[PDB]
């Protein structure tokens, strides 16, 4: 299940990517990919309601030239199926900072050392309703 | 025009595409492209401040299999350079409603009889700040 694919983003460090969308009722999981292209992502944000063995766990990873990196799992899961959830990702060369709906923040290392995000992609059981550049 | 490019969308009749952006200070024109891909556009929204022999005129057109169609010029030009504009677009199989700021809104025929818009792209002296699928 793949949703929108966005290119020519040119989100530079300091800028904030605000993505709001609707989680499906039968939501197994959903994801957001940020990087330069599909085979090179600095952030594979993947909330797992019940998927790939994870129950209510956020799986984050990088992808370098097609190879997934080491996964980082977050136990904070403020998501409910069928709800409209907003997420906010601030870019930075050192790392990425994610703002969940409740105001919970956590970092993810910027492994590819990307100085600019140009690719965005959505997937899973989610419907992007808004993308805001700040 | 090459700015933001969002594909694999599935904007169907009933939803509203809301785009908000910043028009440059030295703005000659900007554009929003809607269709299946770059060679099949149901709408080419090209507000022109001073470009292609057009002074403050909105040029709309379609592109079928790479070939441009007949151009439609509008009566109102509710834009100023160095300002933030927001256009709303209602999708219908026979027409497209483009609701602009200041209460102006026109209709452009859906010459391709498109039942879903899978491609959006921006260009010109426009800076996408927000895009919504409501
Ligand atoms: C609604 C209406 O009536 N509007 C008109 C405007 O159209 C008009 O603009 C002038 O248009 C003249 C050309 O005619 C246009 O229309 C016909 C058909 O109607 C077309 O055949 C022609 O191509 C023009 O149409 C426009 O084409 C472009 C490109 O396809 C369209 O843009 C595209 O649109 C699609 C969307 O569908 C998409 O968005 C694309 O991205 C976009 O690019 C556009 O929409 C379309 N418009 C229309 C209404 O169809 C031009 O002659 C005139 O331009 C001259 O003058 C300006 C400055 O004022 C110059 O910037 C420009 O370069 C050009 O200069 C002239 O160049 C020629 C060639 O170099 C010179 O002649 C040469 O001179 C030599 C000697 O030195 C030799 O003699 C040689 O033989 C000779 O060829 C010429 O001297 C130059 N003139 C000058 C002054 O330098 C302008 O665009 C305006 C203004 O009149 O009036 C409105 O009423």
């Amino acid at each position: 299940a793949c949703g929108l694919v966005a290119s020519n983003l040119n989100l530079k460090p300091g800028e904030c990517l605000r993505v709001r969308g609707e989680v499906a009722a039968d939501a197994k999981s959903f994801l957001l990919n940020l990087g330069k292209d599909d085979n090179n992502l600095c952030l594979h944000f993947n909330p797992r309601f019940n998927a790939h063995g994870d129950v209510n766990t956020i799986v984050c990873n990088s992808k370098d030239a097609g190879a997934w990196g080491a996964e980082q799992r977050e136990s904070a899961f403020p998501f409910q199926p069928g709800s409209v959830v907003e997420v906010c990702i601030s870019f930075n060369q050192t790392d990425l900072t994610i703002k969940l709906p409740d105001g919970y923040e956590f970092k993810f290392p910027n492994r590819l050392n990307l100085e600019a995000i140009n690719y965005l992609s959505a997937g899973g059981d989610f419907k992007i309703k808004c993308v805001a550049f700040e």
Side-chain angles (χ1 to χ4, degrees), chain A:
Chain A
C2 297
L4 78 58
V5 173
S7 313
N8 294 346
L9 254 55
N10 199 225
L11 189 79
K12 296 171 295 169
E15 298 185 35
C16 185
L17 206 205
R18 198 158 302 245
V19 191
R20 178 180 162 119
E22 182 169 277
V23 181
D26 64 304
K28 263 72 198 67
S29 78
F30 61 98
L31 58 92
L32 283 163
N33 293 338
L34 296 72
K36 76 175 293 297
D37 58 61
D38 196 55
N39 292 112
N40 290 89
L41 303 167
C42 54
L43 188 65
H44 170 63
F45 180 62
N46 181 206
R48 317 244 267 239
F49 291 82
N50 222 270
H52 307 279
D54 296 275
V55 171
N56 285 223
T57 301
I58 289 185
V59 173
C60 287
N61 212 335
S62 57
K63 198 177 193 175
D64 209 350
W68 290 109
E71 303 181 318
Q72 172 179 302
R73 271 174 251 255
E74 297 291 334
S75 26
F77 194 76
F79 309 100
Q80 290 289 348
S83 62
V84 169
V85 162
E86 178 191 294
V87 178
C88 186
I89 304 166
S90 59
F91 186 39
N92 182 272
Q93 41 251 83
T94 320
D95 49 43
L96 290 80
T97 305
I98 302 76
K99 284 64 82 178
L100 305 177
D102 62 353
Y104 180 86
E105 298 196 337
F106 71 91
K107 286 169 175 283
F108 183 69
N110 177 1
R111 303 185 197 140
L112 316 196
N113 288 277
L114 295 173
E115 278 73 27
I117 298 178
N118 283 309
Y119 180 87
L120 172 64
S121 171
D125 312 288
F126 178 66
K127 289 187 173 183
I128 289 194
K129 311 311 295 171
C130 173
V131 192
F133 304 90
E134 304 169 348

